[PDB]
Design a binder for this molecule. Structure first.
Ligand SMILES: [Au+]
Ligand SMILES: [Au+]
Ligand SMILES: [Au+]
Ligand SMILES: [Au+]
Ligand SMILES: [Au+]
Lengths: 125, 125
C-alpha cells in the first residue's frame, strides 16, 4: 500500500520526463511527488533535488528556456534558409548549438543572428 | 593588391572556421586578421567582433569550453553505457545537451553526472 503509492506517484512523474522521481526518491520525499520548488531546481540545474528542501527561497526565472537538439535543428534550419528547407551542414548546426550554450539555453540575440546569417552565407557562397 | 591581400587573409581565416573574417571585415580591420582579443570575444560570444576594438580589456577565461553536438553525443554515449556502445535514445541525448546549456558549454559536474546516470538507468530499466 505504501510501496504501490510510491510506485504510482513515481510512474506518473516518469511519464512526464521527470527522471529523478523514482519510487525511492518519492519515499524519501514522504510519499509525495516533488513540489514546484524541487521541480524548478531540477529543471534549471539537472541535479537531483534534495527530498528535504522545499526550494521556496530558490531564486529563479519563471521563463526557463532550455533547448533540445530538435529545437536547435529547427532554429538552425530556418536561419540557414536552404532551398526545399533541407537540413543544414553539421558545421552550421554546431555553431547554432554553441549559441544556445553561450546563452544558457536561450536562442540567438540580434547580434548572434547576424553572425549566424553571415556564417550560413559563407557556407553556401 | 589590396583586394587580394584581404581575400588571402580572409581565406586563411575561413579555412579555420573563423566565419566572421570576411574580406570586408579584414578591410575594415585595416588589412589584418583578428587580434587574439577579437578572436576570444567572437569565440565566447559568437557575435561579430568590432573591427575597431582590440578587446585587450575584455575579461575572459583562458579555457573556453563550448561543445559541438559530436562532443555531446560522445559524452551521452559513454554515460548511457549501452552494449556495443550504440547510440542512446534521443530523449537521453537531449538531457545531456541541456546540461551543456546549463553549464554555459561545460560538461556535467558530479551532481549532474548522477542525475544523468539515474536517467540512463530508468530509460533502460
Ligand atoms: Au517558479
Ligand atoms: Au557575396
Ligand atoms: Au585570452
Ligand atoms: Au551562463
Ligand atoms: Au532497479
Amino acid at each position: 500500500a505504501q510501496r504501490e503509492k510510491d510506485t504510482r506517484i513515481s510512474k506518473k512523474m516518469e511519464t512526464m520526463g521527470i527522471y529523478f522521481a523514482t519510487p525511492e526518491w518519492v519515499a524519501l520525499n514522504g510519499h509525495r511527488g516533488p513540489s514546484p520548488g524541487q521541480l524548478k531546481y531540477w529543471q534549471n540545474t539537472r541535479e537531483i533535488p534534495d527530498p528535504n528542501e522545499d526550494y521556496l527561497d530558490y531564486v529563479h526565472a519563471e521563463k526557463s528556456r532550455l533547448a533540445s537538439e530538435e529545437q536547435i535543428l529547427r532554429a538552425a534550419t530556418s536561419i540557414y534558409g536552404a532551398p526545399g528547407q533541407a537540413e543544414p551542414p553539421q558545421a552550421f548546426i554546431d555553431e547554432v548549438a554553441k549559441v544556445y550554450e553561450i546563452n544558457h539555453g536561450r536562442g540567438p540575440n540580434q547580434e548572434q543572428m547576424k553572425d549566424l546569417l553571415l556564417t550560413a552565407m559563407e557556407m553556401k557562397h
